[PDB]
């Protein structure tokens, strides 16, 4: 069958900030496990998949995806500075997705190394239940041994190469300090297992395997966070954690099955468990193109099985695709295979229609796993003919990697989720694709809509004639049409040519020139000729009709509204709320957690420029926040007037 069984598999990722030594921890984890999107490796008779995590946490869709791709996680905090904001954001969404973790405190060998400290942070900052399963002997230059509390054994480190590690027994000076530590460890665990509670409050005997059995159950349930220690560059405690990943971190079966809807039914719950008996289900988390093997599509299989030389269903594209050969990228080597069993990760060579976020599924099946309008845009203008060719190419590729943006080539215009999003796409084109170009200022995408109703006609004399009713749709509902023609006063053939005529006229906008949205239209009447009426001549009617309505239905400009979630000490609230209110925002709801207050607001994206610099300035590096597009709202009179005058 397979090589490693499900129970023998570990899907992990490493969340940390380099200042905590992210490179050096992974670099070394690759070595020890090796005998890049996802690197297939192994430790102690266990398949270990190390999945890459986004270079920046502000990418919510990336970060969210990699999270459903990985079952487990390991964290790296600096022993000196303890937990930090960057990882704080990501620790919480991990919890929302139910990702079991074990904390690894690194750089114990450096000035200001404090273990007890970093442990506290998880408590005071994160409200997390965590206790060390190990204790350090020494700190800074002194870091020498490590006490494993579960086995109650000590390991001495004689070299920076991680070789010749002589096991010993705990020196008495640390025996008592260790005694308590394990006792405090069992308590923190005992909370959720009351069968354990008896053993402990009855002064019963706690064995090793028995205790280890206890911890894993609390950790896979995300109710506990074992804490470890070491130093990556110097090869200390590294082999210990890897062991720990095996004993504690989850397998594919030890977590909660992934969920998605159906191709037929957009809302239905579909559980995909890990089963070889069941039908194939899988998700593609990254794509890249190699100079030799061609297009490379990384993915993960949640259910069933798969083989090369066969067909599958891309249910996101509604298309059939044939699988070429299959590659696993090991530490130093690439390995070709046939079957990918449930719960594992490989890369598919040669695929046509499958991009990032696309859902590969069995044939007889339906289910889709994963599931976008730009609020911001830029203008980029290459220097000379030479490059302008390349850009137009690169653009073509990128939607495959990140279909969160779009291109309008009318000089180019790109738009997407946020000021950071774009700042990548450009900085990709500039470096990866080597394009000389000049980028303009970031700009929000406004819109237009109707606050009133009316019935209008427009008529084109070639001849076409139409009567349409115009009512504003509710915000967010989009555009809707109705064909009210009865006796065929408007011949059927020409009907769709109206609806087409309507939009193209709406796109350009009637007021400041922005797209017109949230408007309902009904075609109730018209007339024609047989040598004149066209599919062409009408469109101009729909055009003339929309323009008649524009003098009537009282158009206005919309701006995108963001939902900002802030976190800081309750001291400064005097400021922030003064800061929001000057941004044309308002405060809806609030709540504390731990010692900090969680503010929840609504702000115009056009007033959100230069924020972080205004947070870190008022709260002194203390503040934090996120942001989302939420809804569209109407611009105030005096502001709208400037948008009208500015665009001539």
Curated annotation (Swiss-Prot):
What PROSITE patterns does this protein's entry cite?
G_TR_1, G_TR_2
What PANTHER family does the record tag this protein with?
RIBOSOME-RELEASING FACTOR 2, MITOCHONDRIAL, TRANSLATION ELONGATION FACTOR G-RELATED
Protein name in UniProt: Elongation factor G
Q: Which GO terms describe its cellular component?
A: cytoplasm
Tell me which Gene3D superfamilies the record gives.
3.30.230.10, 3.30.70.240, Elongation Factor G (Translational Gtpase), domain 3, P-loop containing nucleotide triphosphate hydrolases, Translation factors
Biological processes per GO annotation: ribosome disassembly
* Record's subcellular location: Cytoplasm
Domain tr-type G as annotated: residue spans: 7-253
Report if keyword GTP-binding is assigned. Answer: yes
Q: Which residues form the signal peptide?
A: none
Known role: Catalyzes the GTP-dependent ribosomal translocation step during translation elongation. During this step, the ribosome changes from the pre-translocational (PRE) to the post-translocational (POST) state as the newly formed A-site-bound peptidyl-tRNA and P-site-bound deacylated tRNA move to the P and E sites, respectively. Catalyzes the coordinated movement of the two tRNA molecules, the mRNA and conformational changes in the ribosome.
Q: Which Pfam families match?
A: EFG_C (PF00679), EFG_III (PF14492), EFG_IV (PF03764), GTP_EFTU (PF00009), GTP_EFTU_D2 (PF03144)
MF terms (GO), sorted A to Z: GTP binding; GTPase activity; translation elongation factor activity
Q: Which UniProt keywords apply?
A: Cytoplasm, Elongation factor, GTP-binding, Nucleotide-binding, Protein biosynthesis
Residue positions annotated to bind GTP are: 16-23, 52-56, 106-109
């Amino acid at each position: 069958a397979r090589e490693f069984s499900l129970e023998k598999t570990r899907n992990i990722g490493i969340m940390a900030h380099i200042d905590a030594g992210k490179t050096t921890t992974t670099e070394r984890i690759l070595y020890y496990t090796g005998r890049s999107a996802a690197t297939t490796a192994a430790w102690e008779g266990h398949r270990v998949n190390i999945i890459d995590t986004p270079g920046h946490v502000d990418l919510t869709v990336e970060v969210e995806r990699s999270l459903r791709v990985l079952d487990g996680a390991v964290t790296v905090l600096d022993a000196q500075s303890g937990v930090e904001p960057q990882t704080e954001t990501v620790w919480r969404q991990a919890t929302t997705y139910g990702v079991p973790r074990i904390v690894f405190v690194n750089k114990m060998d450096k000035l200001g190394a404090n273990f007890e400290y970093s442990v506290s942070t998880l408590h005071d900052r994160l409200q997390a239940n965590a206790a060390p399963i190990q204790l350090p002997i020494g700190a800074e230059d002194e870091f020498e041994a490590i006490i494993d509390l579960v086995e109650m054994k000590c390991f001495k480190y004689t070299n920076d190469l991680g070789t010749e590690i002589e096991e010993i027994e705990i020196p008495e000076d640390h025996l008592d300090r260790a005694e308590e530590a394990r006792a405090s460890l069992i308590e923190a665990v005992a909370e959720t297992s009351d069968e354990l509670m008896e053993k402990y409050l009855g002064d019963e005997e706690i064995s090793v395997s028995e205790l280890k059995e206890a911890i894993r159950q609390a950790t896979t349930n995300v109710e506990f966070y074992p804490v470890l220690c070491g130093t990556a560059f110097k090869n200390k405690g590294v082999q210990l954690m890897l062991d720990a990943v095996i004993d504690y971190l989850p397998s594919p079966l030890d977590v909660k099955p992934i969920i998605g809807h159906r191709a037929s039914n957009p809302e239905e719950e579909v559980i995909a468990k890990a089963d070889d008996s069941a039908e194939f289900a899988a998700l593609a988390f990254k794509v890249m193109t190699d100079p030799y093997v061609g297009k490379l599509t990384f993915f993960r299989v949640y259910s069933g099985t798969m083989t090369s030389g066969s067909y599958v269903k891309n249910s996101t594209k509604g298309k059939r695709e044939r699988v070429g050969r299959l590659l696993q990228m090991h530490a130093n080597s690439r390995q070709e295979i046939d079957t990918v069993y449930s719960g594992d990760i490989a890369a598919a060579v040669g695929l046509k229609d499958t991009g990032t976020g696309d859902t590969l599924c069995g044939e007889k099946n339906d289910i889709i796993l994963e599931s976008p309008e730009p609020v911001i845009h830029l203008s980029v203008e290459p220097k000379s003919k030479a490059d302008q060719d390349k850009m137009t190419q690169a653009l073509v590729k990128l939607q495959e990697e990140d279909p969160t943006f779009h291109a309008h080539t009318d000089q180019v215009i790109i738009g997407g989720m946020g000021e950071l999003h774009l700042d990548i796409l450009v900085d990709r084109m500039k470096k990866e694709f080597n394009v000389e170009c000049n980028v303009g200022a970031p700009m929000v995408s406004y819109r237009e809509t109707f606050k009133s109703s009316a019935q209008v006609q427009g008529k084109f004399s070639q001849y076409g004639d139409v009567h349409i009713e115009f009512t504003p749709n509710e915000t967010g509902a989009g555009f809707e049409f109705e064909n009210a023609i009865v006796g065929g006063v408007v011949p059927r053939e020409y009907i769709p040519s109206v609806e087409a005529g309507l939009k193209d006229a709406m796109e350009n906008g009637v007021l400041a020139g922005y797209p017109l949205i949230d408007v309902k239209a009904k075609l109730y009447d018209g007339s024609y000729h047989d040598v004149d009426s066209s599919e062409m001549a009408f469109k101009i009617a729909a055009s003339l009709a929309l323009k008649e309505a524009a003098k009537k239905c009282d158009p206005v400009i919309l701006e995108p509204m963001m939902k900002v979630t802030i976190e800081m000490p309750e001291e400064y609230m005097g400021d922030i709320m003064g800061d929001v209110t000057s941004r044309r925002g308002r405060v809806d709801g609030m709540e504390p957690r731990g010692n900090a207050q969680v503010v929840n607001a609504y702000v115009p994206l056009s007033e959100m420029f230069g924020y972080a610099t205004s947070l870190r300035s008022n709260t002194q590096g203390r503040g934090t926040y996120t942001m989302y597009f939420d809804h569209y709202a109407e611009v105030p009179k005096s502001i709208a007037e400037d948008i009208i005058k500015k665009n001539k």
